[model samples]
Target: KETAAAKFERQHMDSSTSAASSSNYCNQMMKSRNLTKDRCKPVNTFVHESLADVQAVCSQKNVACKNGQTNCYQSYSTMSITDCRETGSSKYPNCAYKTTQANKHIIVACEGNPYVPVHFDASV
Candidate 1:
């Protein structure tokens, strides 16, 4: 069987410079949720696959990314996984992105063998 990474790499070849429309994105997100069992998906997937479907997916369970839900960033090359949980925020809050109170942008890289979608909250 082909690995998720291999499959992702093989099928995912995003070469666009602009984001997708809300309606269009949401449709895809719903499909993703249906495929992943409605759990919290990775940010990378949200950006690439889910970003387009954030509305449909998030809305399914009343989870919505408001106007500023994500703290957009430019480059996320040195992001890591050890930066998951906050200093102390009532235990793990499911899979989340990298956020810093001081830094202008936080690198978010979903950690895993197959690699989950991760997005950096740079708007902080």
Candidate 2:
């Protein structure tokens, strides 16, 4: 089964050296990560931090998710984040993105036995 946890890792985690600086970052990442298959993923963010670092956010402080779920947690530390936004006129086949780099505390939703991050809620 392609678990939500696995999807979360593939979509958000980027501990290795990559680009928030490149305008091409989102275009490549979105397609490579299989998020641009049918339609353009309007926005996404990648955390340039360790899996452990991001997972640890689960214990920070419980909060309501955007959808009002109670399983969300907010991170205390400001982590490196690269935000990607799709171009308005970008078509499905040629999805283009603009990247914005920042350092901020993130909110995430956690689930499953090991309590890993399943969704990135937002940054504060």
Candidate 3:
């Protein structure tokens, strides 16, 4: 089974390279990552930080999640992030997105004995 931590990495991690110089970054990424498989992922954020660094954030203090969960943690320092938002013309079977990169503190839900990120909560 795909573990929660693995799912989090698939949906959020982008450590291999900086998201730069791509006119169709989101269109390509969203598709490649399978975010457009079943239905279009209207909005998604890819954190351009190492998995080790991201995992360390689980040791941070607790923060509020959008769904009111208490297991969420926010990174102490801001990190590089890429935001992909679906376009208005986007429809099922053809997902589209707009890309925006920035540095921001991330919030993700953590669990397990080692306390790994299992879900992306939000960015601040």
Candidate 4:
């Protein structure tokens, strides 16, 4: 079974890519990273930072989740990230996405003994 921490890394971590060169980066990454399996992930953010840096966010300032959860935290520093949004024309098994890059504080849901990001809540 995949742990929450592992899943977060799979879904959101991309240290090598500082910026998206081609619009197809998300289209290729979403599929190559196995996020396009059952259905396309509607929207996802990939942080281009070290795993340690991302994990450190668990100890950052607390924040309210969009749905009212209290376990969310926001990074104090701006981080490099790429936002992948599914286009209207996106279809399952043929998912297409728009790639955008930005520097922002990431918000995430944390959990577990070591306290690592479990969910990618948002970027601000």
Candidate 5:
């Protein structure tokens, strides 16, 4: 089973050793979607079991790579993913998930903001 970093590294990373450097779309996400500036904070209300799960769906739906990796798969920057742990926090978690998945720059509005994605990239 591939680790999340391994999964991200395999397809998205480049000679730059940075997926952000390799994917022009990620730059776009930072600029247009304010992902870097915090203006457009990614709603944490994502569906699926873990970040790995979101990665799996995004890889399968958008990326050219197959979801052959066991733990997770790298996703295209265009595909945004959300997370929500409780139902009360999101009126329609599924719809919010769909919005992020469908549109790259969509504002996945959430309540209690629990859908905040905690990046544990190097966590073992």
Candidate 6:
């Protein structure tokens, strides 16, 4: 079974390489990461930073989650990231995404022992 931390790594972490280098980045990553298994993830962000730096966000000031939960925290520093947004032409089993890279303060929900990001709440 996949733990929360493990899931977070799969969904958000991309430390070794920049997946946003190409226009098809999101299409490749979304499928390769298994996010396109059952359905296309409409919007997802990949943090192009180390897991340590990403995890440290848990200790930052608390913020309200999109759904109103208080478990969310925003990163203290601007970080490199890739935002994958599904294109209008995208359809089931053939998900296409617009690959965009930017530096933004990421918001994430943290949880568990060692308290790390469990959900990518948003990027601001």
Q: Pick the candidate with the highest lDDT.
A: 6
- Tell me the lDDT of model 6 at 51: 93
- The parts of candidate 6 lying over 4 Å away from their true place are 20-23
lDDT of 2 by residue, 60-121 (tens): 88999999899999998888988889987888788888878888889999999898899999
Segments of candidate 4 deviating more than 4 angstroms:
20-23
TM-score of each: 0.26, 0.92, 0.93, 0.94, 0.19, 0.94
Question: Which candidate order results from sorting by TM-score in descending order?
Answer: 4, 6, 3, 2, 1, 5
| Local accuracy by lDDT, each model | 0.29, 0.87, 0.88, 0.89, 0.28, 0.90
Give residue 9's error in model 3 in angstroms: 0.9
Worst 10 residues of 6 by lDDT: 16-25
**Could you give candidate 3's per-residue lDDT for residues 1-124 as a string of tens digits?**
9987788888889895569545688888888888999999899999888999999999896888899879899999998998999999999898888898889999999988778998888899
- Residue 121 in candidate 5 has what lDDT? 20
What is the Cα-based lDDT of residue 29 in candidate 4?
A: 83
Model 2 Cα RMSD, 1 decimal: 1.7
Root-mean-square deviation (CA) per prediction: 14.8, 1.7, 1.4, 1.5, 16.8, 1.5
lDDT of 6 by residue, 28-77 (tens): 89888999989988999999899999999999979999998999999999
RMSD of 6: 1.5
Q: Candidate 2 vs candidate 4: which has greater TM-score?
A: 4
In TM-score terms, candidate 1 sits at 0.26
